[PDB]
Design an enzyme around this catalytic site. Structure first.
Site, PDB file in Angstrom:
ATOM      1  N   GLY A  56     -20.383 -60.863-110.181  1.00 53.98           N
ATOM      2  CA  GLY A  56     -19.885 -61.367-111.451  1.00 53.98           C
ATOM      3  C   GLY A  56     -18.729 -60.586-112.044  1.00 53.98           C
ATOM      4  N   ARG A  57     -18.810 -60.291-113.344  1.00 48.43           N
ATOM      5  CA  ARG A  57     -17.716 -59.593-114.013  1.00 48.43           C
ATOM      6  C   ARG A  57     -17.526 -58.178-113.473  1.00 48.43           C
ATOM      7  N   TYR A  58     -18.597 -57.557-112.968  1.00 48.74           N
ATOM      8  CA  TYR A  58     -18.503 -56.218-112.391  1.00 48.74           C
ATOM      9  C   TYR A  58     -17.517 -56.145-111.232  1.00 48.74           C
ATOM     10  CZ  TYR A  58     -22.885 -54.972-114.833  1.00 48.74           C
ATOM     11  OH  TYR A  58     -23.852 -54.716-115.777  1.00 48.74           O
ATOM     12  N   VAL A 145     -22.122 -49.644-108.749  1.00 49.26           N
ATOM     13  CA  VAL A 145     -20.665 -49.709-108.749  1.00 49.26           C
ATOM     14  C   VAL A 145     -20.064 -49.172-110.042  1.00 49.26           C
ATOM     15  CG1 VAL A 145     -20.491 -52.040-109.710  1.00 49.26           C
ATOM     16  CG2 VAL A 145     -18.713 -51.181-108.148  1.00 49.26           C
ATOM     17  N   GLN A 166     -31.749 -38.006-113.075  1.00 45.58           N
ATOM     18  CA  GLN A 166     -31.092 -38.741-114.146  1.00 45.58           C
ATOM     19  C   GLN A 166     -30.621 -37.764-115.216  1.00 45.58           C
ATOM     20  OE1 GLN A 166     -30.695 -40.085-117.220  1.00 45.58           O
ATOM     21  NE2 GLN A 166     -31.113 -42.291-117.227  1.00 45.58           N
ATOM     22  N   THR A 178     -39.453 -42.159-118.870  1.00 45.94           N
ATOM     23  CA  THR A 178     -39.611 -43.598-119.057  1.00 45.94           C
ATOM     24  C   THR A 178     -40.158 -44.296-117.816  1.00 45.94           C
ATOM     25  OG1 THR A 178     -37.294 -43.969-118.451  1.00 45.94           O
ATOM     26  CG2 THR A 178     -37.794 -43.582-120.786  1.00 45.94           C
ATOM     27  N   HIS A 199     -32.717 -41.146-110.936  1.00 42.62           N
ATOM     28  CA  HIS A 199     -31.788 -42.202-111.305  1.00 42.62           C
ATOM     29  C   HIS A 199     -31.600 -43.146-110.126  1.00 42.62           C
ATOM     30  CE1 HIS A 199     -27.688 -43.246-113.397  1.00 42.62           C
ATOM     31  NE2 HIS A 199     -28.559 -44.238-113.431  1.00 42.62           N
ATOM     32  N   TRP A 233     -37.965 -50.530-116.180  1.00 41.97           N
ATOM     33  CA  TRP A 233     -36.602 -50.300-115.718  1.00 41.97           C
ATOM     34  C   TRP A 233     -36.399 -50.842-114.308  1.00 41.97           C
ATOM     35  CZ3 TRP A 233     -32.799 -49.343-118.900  1.00 41.97           C
ATOM     36  CH2 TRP A 233     -33.103 -48.799-120.155  1.00 41.97           C
ATOM     37  N   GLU A 236     -35.557 -49.160-110.754  1.00 35.87           N
ATOM     38  CA  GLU A 236     -35.655 -47.726-111.008  1.00 35.87           C
ATOM     39  C   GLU A 236     -37.095 -47.299-111.274  1.00 35.87           C
ATOM     40  OE1 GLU A 236     -33.927 -45.398-114.685  1.00 35.87           O
ATOM     41  OE2 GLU A 236     -32.598 -45.117-112.958  1.00 35.87           O
ATOM     42  N   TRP A 275     -20.784 -41.437-114.910  1.00 34.16           N
ATOM     43  CA  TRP A 275     -21.070 -42.813-115.286  1.00 34.16           C
ATOM     44  C   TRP A 275     -19.812 -43.492-115.812  1.00 34.16           C
ATOM     45  CZ3 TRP A 275     -26.452 -43.633-118.011  1.00 34.16           C
ATOM     46  CH2 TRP A 275     -27.420 -42.840-117.383  1.00 34.16           C
ATOM     47  N   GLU A 279     -21.675 -51.429-120.620  1.00 32.34           N
ATOM     48  CA  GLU A 279     -21.369 -52.508-121.563  1.00 32.34           C
ATOM     49  C   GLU A 279     -22.189 -53.724-121.139  1.00 32.34           C
ATOM     50  N   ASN A 281     -23.397 -56.159-122.856  1.00 33.51           N
ATOM     51  CA  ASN A 281     -23.003 -57.405-123.499  1.00 33.51           C
ATOM     52  C   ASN A 281     -21.626 -57.892-123.064  1.00 33.51           C
ATOM     53  OD1 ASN A 281     -20.810 -57.050-125.890  1.00 33.51           O
ATOM     54  ND2 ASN A 281     -21.951 -55.143-125.573  1.00 33.51           N
ATOM     55  N   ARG A 284     -21.917 -57.639-118.395  1.00 31.29           N
ATOM     56  CA  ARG A 284     -23.121 -58.303-117.910  1.00 31.29           C
ATOM     57  C   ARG A 284     -23.318 -59.645-118.608  1.00 31.29           C
ATOM     58  NH1 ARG A 284     -28.292 -54.750-118.605  1.00 31.29           N
ATOM     59  NH2 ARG A 284     -27.241 -53.523-116.976  1.00 31.29           N
TER      60      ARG A 284
HETATM   61  O1  LIG Z   1     -24.105 -58.425-113.443  1.00 31.77           O
HETATM   62  C1  LIG Z   1     -24.386 -57.496-112.670  1.00 31.77           C
HETATM   63  C2  LIG Z   1     -25.591 -56.726-112.696  1.00 31.77           C
HETATM   64  C3  LIG Z   1     -25.771 -55.738-111.804  1.00 31.77           C
HETATM   65  N1  LIG Z   1     -24.827 -55.429-110.847  1.00 31.77           N
HETATM   66  C4  LIG Z   1     -25.044 -54.329-109.898  1.00 31.77           C
HETATM   67  O2  LIG Z   1     -26.320 -53.766-110.158  1.00 31.77           O
HETATM   68  C5  LIG Z   1     -26.175 -52.394-110.585  1.00 31.77           C
HETATM   69  C6  LIG Z   1     -27.205 -52.061-111.632  1.00 31.77           C
HETATM   70  O3  LIG Z   1     -26.799 -52.597-112.908  1.00 31.77           O
HETATM   71  P1  LIG Z   1     -26.368 -51.524-114.037  1.00 31.77           P
HETATM   72  O4  LIG Z   1     -25.388 -50.557-113.504  1.00 31.77           O
HETATM   73  O5  LIG Z   1     -25.873 -52.321-115.237  1.00 31.77           O
HETATM   74  O6  LIG Z   1     -27.704 -50.781-114.485  1.00 31.77           O
HETATM   75  P2  LIG Z   1     -27.957 -49.411-115.257  1.00 31.77           P
HETATM   76  O7  LIG Z   1     -27.277 -48.280-114.601  1.00 31.77           O
HETATM   77  O8  LIG Z   1     -27.440 -49.625-116.675  1.00 31.77           O
HETATM   78  O9  LIG Z   1     -29.568 -49.261-115.403  1.00 31.77           O
HETATM   79  C7  LIG Z   1     -30.550 -48.711-114.501  1.00 31.77           C
HETATM   80  O10 LIG Z   1     -31.647 -49.592-114.360  1.00 31.77           O
HETATM   81  C8  LIG Z   1     -31.283 -50.808-113.696  1.00 31.77           C
HETATM   82  C9  LIG Z   1     -32.465 -51.736-113.820  1.00 31.77           C
HETATM   83  O11 LIG Z   1     -32.764 -51.998-115.185  1.00 31.77           O
HETATM   84  C10 LIG Z   1     -30.905 -50.481-112.257  1.00 31.77           C
HETATM   85  O12 LIG Z   1     -32.024 -49.894-111.601  1.00 31.77           O
HETATM   86  C11 LIG Z   1     -29.730 -49.514-112.253  1.00 31.77           C
HETATM   87  O13 LIG Z   1     -29.457 -49.099-110.918  1.00 31.77           O
HETATM   88  C12 LIG Z   1     -30.010 -48.299-113.132  1.00 31.77           C
HETATM   89  O14 LIG Z   1     -28.823 -47.527-113.279  1.00 31.77           O
HETATM   90  C13 LIG Z   1     -24.726 -52.280-111.033  1.00 31.77           C
HETATM   91  O15 LIG Z   1     -24.270 -50.935-110.950  1.00 31.77           O
HETATM   92  C14 LIG Z   1     -24.019 -53.195-110.038  1.00 31.77           C
HETATM   93  O16 LIG Z   1     -23.815 -52.548-108.787  1.00 31.77           O
HETATM   94  C15 LIG Z   1     -23.643 -56.132-110.760  1.00 31.77           C
HETATM   95  O17 LIG Z   1     -22.788 -55.889-109.917  1.00 31.77           O
HETATM   96  N2  LIG Z   1     -23.488 -57.133-111.686  1.00 31.77           N
HETATM   97  O1  LIG Z   2     -34.557 -44.325-119.187  1.00 33.91           O
HETATM   98  C1  LIG Z   2     -34.010 -44.949-118.032  1.00 33.91           C
HETATM   99  C2  LIG Z   2     -32.660 -45.558-118.326  1.00 33.91           C
HETATM  100  O2  LIG Z   2     -31.902 -44.549-119.010  1.00 33.91           O
HETATM  101  C3  LIG Z   2     -30.643 -45.009-119.464  1.00 33.91           C
HETATM  102  O3  LIG Z   2     -29.974 -43.940-120.076  1.00 33.91           O
HETATM  103  C4  LIG Z   2     -30.131 -43.780-121.492  1.00 33.91           C
HETATM  104  C5  LIG Z   2     -31.364 -42.922-121.718  1.00 33.91           C
HETATM  105  O4  LIG Z   2     -32.531 -43.636-121.326  1.00 33.91           O
HETATM  106  C6  LIG Z   2     -31.462 -42.531-123.186  1.00 33.91           C
HETATM  107  O5  LIG Z   2     -32.525 -41.603-123.369  1.00 33.91           O
HETATM  108  C7  LIG Z   2     -30.154 -41.906-123.664  1.00 33.91           C
HETATM  109  O6  LIG Z   2     -30.252 -41.615-125.018  1.00 33.91           O
HETATM  110  O7  LIG Z   2     -29.072 -42.806-123.422  1.00 33.91           O
HETATM  111  C8  LIG Z   2     -28.887 -43.089-122.027  1.00 33.91           C
HETATM  112  C9  LIG Z   2     -27.639 -43.932-121.906  1.00 33.91           C
HETATM  113  O8  LIG Z   2     -27.903 -45.299-122.188  1.00 33.91           O
HETATM  114  C10 LIG Z   2     -29.781 -45.460-118.292  1.00 33.91           C
HETATM  115  O9  LIG Z   2     -28.571 -46.028-118.781  1.00 33.91           O
HETATM  116  C11 LIG Z   2     -30.515 -46.479-117.435  1.00 33.91           C
HETATM  117  O10 LIG Z   2     -29.757 -46.698-116.253  1.00 33.91           O
HETATM  118  C12 LIG Z   2     -31.908 -45.985-117.069  1.00 33.91           C
HETATM  119  O11 LIG Z   2     -31.809 -44.877-116.181  1.00 33.91           O
END
Ligand SMILES: O=c1ccn([C@@H]2O[C@H](COP(=O)(O)OP(=O)(O)O[C@H]3O[C@H](CO)[C@H](O)[C@H](O)[C@H]3O)[C@@H](O)[C@H]2O)c(=O)[nH]1
Ligand SMILES: OC[C@H]1O[C@@H](O[C@H]2[C@H](O)[C@@H](O)[C@H](O)O[C@@H]2CO)[C@H](O)[C@@H](O)[C@H]1O
Ligand SMILES: [Co+2]
Length: 284
Positions: A56-58, A145, A166, A178, A199, A233, A236, A275, A279, A281, A284
């Site tokens: 998608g947008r990613y 990514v 993490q 968590t 993480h 999560w 994760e 990181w 974003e 909203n 995604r």
């Molecule tokens: O629309 C999307 C959604 C997800 N992804 C892929 O899936 C991965 C995971 O999505 P996020 O990076 O948005 O997730 P977060 O880092 O914010 O949150 C954490 O929890 C998630 C589940 O809630 C996943 O386990 C993720 O790897 C972990 O970093 C992205 O990096 C990307 O590689 C996309 O490409 N497009």
């Molecule tokens: O808790 C798992 C979840 O953590 C997010 O990171 C948060 C963290 O949980 C919070 O305590 C801190 O205040 O802000 C961080 C940034 O949003 C991660 O983004 C997510 O990928 C999960 O790993």
């Protein structure tokens, strides 16, 4: 052969956790001798793989920055194959690759929910490990990514099974982790248990171990969906349950996956990867 003493000195970083009770190193800047390992692994003629999903947008913005930074910093000195999974191949960006780097691109069916997009990575990775990656590389990393390499991410991170601390939780109390806390989920971890909060943005190992990581996580994801429950999560939560049961042989400090929104404490000497701004909203 290789022994921990040859390349790892935990006493160089006395203020942080550098060893686990199951004998795994926690790799911090200053503890590792990369030159010893570069020479060790070059003799073996290793190739390192790296999977990344972009749906998608990613797909466009993050991927270019990820791949550009990856080619610059990831395992330089050794052959690397970048495995790219996308939902629309035409949006895949053109990135010139350095010596000993190449890539393969695969079209995947994008899932409806952003949570299944992330969790389905586990199934897809396993399928490609069996189909070809097990024959193409000696070690494999699987990454989100939405991050960028900042400095050398090298062979000091290699091992049978590699987990990432993490950044927000590496000094926290396990009761504050968590984890998934509902006994009905396959990812359940009770309070008072757990070693670290890992993480899901980075994990790796040999193709064999990564296959077991992704297969076991996906079984738990499936068993959960068959009981109409989704872990707090998502993948994760299952990954943390996996590494609790199957200890990683190597752990990477938060320096290897840092969130600058935290700040820059003295613990973080040299950031190898950071990181991107989450974003949910917007992208995604
Ligand atoms: O629309 C999307 C959604 C997800 N992804 C892929 O899936 C991965 C995971 O999505 P996020 O990076 O948005 O997730 P977060 O880092 O914010 O949150 C954490 O929890 C998630 C589940 O809630 C996943 O386990 C993720 O790897 C972990 O970093 C992205 O990096 C990307 O590689 C996309 O490409 N497009
Ligand atoms: O808790 C798992 C979840 O953590 C997010 O990171 C948060 C963290 O949980 C919070 O305590 C801190 O205040 O802000 C961080 C940034 O949003 C991660 O983004 C997510 O990928 C999960 O790993
Ligand atoms: Co992410």
């Amino acid at each position: 052969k290789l022994k921990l003493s040859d390349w790892f000195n935990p006493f160089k970083r006395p203020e942080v956790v550098t060893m686990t009770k199951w004998k795994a190193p926690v790799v911090w800047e200053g503890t590792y001798n990369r030159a010893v390992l570069d020479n060790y692994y070059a003799k073996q003629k290793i190739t390192v793989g790296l999977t990344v999903f972009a749906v998608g947008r990613y797909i466009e913005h993050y991927l270019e920055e990820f791949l550009t930074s990856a080619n610059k910093h990831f395992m330089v000195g050794h052959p690397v194959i970048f495995y790219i999974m996308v939902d629309d191949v035409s949006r895949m960006p053109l990135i010139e690759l350095g010596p000993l780097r190449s890539f393969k691109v695969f079209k995947i069916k994008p899932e409806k929910r952003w949570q299944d997009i992330s969790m389905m990575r586990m199934k897809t990775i396993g399928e490609h490990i069996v189909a070809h990656i097990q024959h193409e590389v000696d070690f494999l990393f699987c990454m989100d990514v939405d991050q960028v390499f900042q400095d050398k991410f090298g062979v000091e991170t290699l091992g049978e099974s590699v987990a990432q601390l993490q950044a927000w939780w590496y000094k926290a109390d396990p009761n504050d982790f968590t984890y998934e806390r509902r006994k009905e989920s396959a990812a359940y971890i009770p309070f008072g248990e757990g070693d670290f909060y890992y993480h899901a943005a980075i994990f790796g190992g040999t193709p064999t171990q990564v296959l077991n990581i992704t297969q076991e996580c996906f079984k738990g994801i499936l068993k959960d969906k068959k009981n109409d429950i989704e872990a707090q999560w998502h993948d994760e939560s299952h990954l943390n349950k996996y590494f609790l049961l199957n200890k990683p042989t190597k752990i990477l400090s938060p320096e290897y996956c840092w969130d600058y929104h935290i700040g820059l404490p003295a613990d973080i000497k040299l950031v190898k990867m950071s990181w991107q701004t989450k974003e949910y909203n917007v992208v995604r």
